[PDB]
Amino acid sequence: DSQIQFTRHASDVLLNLNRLRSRDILTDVVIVVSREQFRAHKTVLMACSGLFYSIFTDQLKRNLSVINLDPEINPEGFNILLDFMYTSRLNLREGNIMAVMATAMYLQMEHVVDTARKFIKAS
Numbered sequence: 001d002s003q004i005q006f007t008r009h010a011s012d013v014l015l016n017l018n019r020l021r022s023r024d025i026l027t028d029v030v031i032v033v034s035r036e037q038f039r040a041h042k043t044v045l046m047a048c049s050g051l052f053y054s055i056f057t058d059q060l061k062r063n064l065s066v067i068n069l070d071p072e073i074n075p076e077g078f079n080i081l082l083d084f085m086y087t088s089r090l091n092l093r094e095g096n097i098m099a100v101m102a103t104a105m106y107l108q109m110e111h112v113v114d115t116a117r118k119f120i121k122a123s
């Protein structure tokens, strides 16, 4: 359209959302993955994950303050993906590819899943 495009604005917003998460400012949910807990903003979770979107869009579950993931989900793989959500940077390596891909499929993060497929292809 005719509007001025700020190419860095979305990245600046996300960096500031990550700063708010680092200070626990306005976080409203805890994700439990076995023995670990991770605080986050439900809006960011919904904007990144089909699983979280499907949970919180339902008015029955929108006010949930705790979500328990499947016990077969790897806490390290979840943390890598939560960091990705808030940075646009994905820590993919041969030592973690299968755990990250499993967690991305479970969380319904289609672009990360497509990227992990491309990673396996270029390995």
Ligand SMILES: Nc1ncnc(Nc2ccccc2Cl)n1
Pocket (backbone or CB within 6 Å): 046, 047, 048, 049, 050, 051, 053, 054, 108
């Ligand atoms: N349409 C809409 N509006 C707000 N967030 C989302 N999230 C979403 C839904 C399903 C799949 C993946 C995501 Cl990131 N989608």
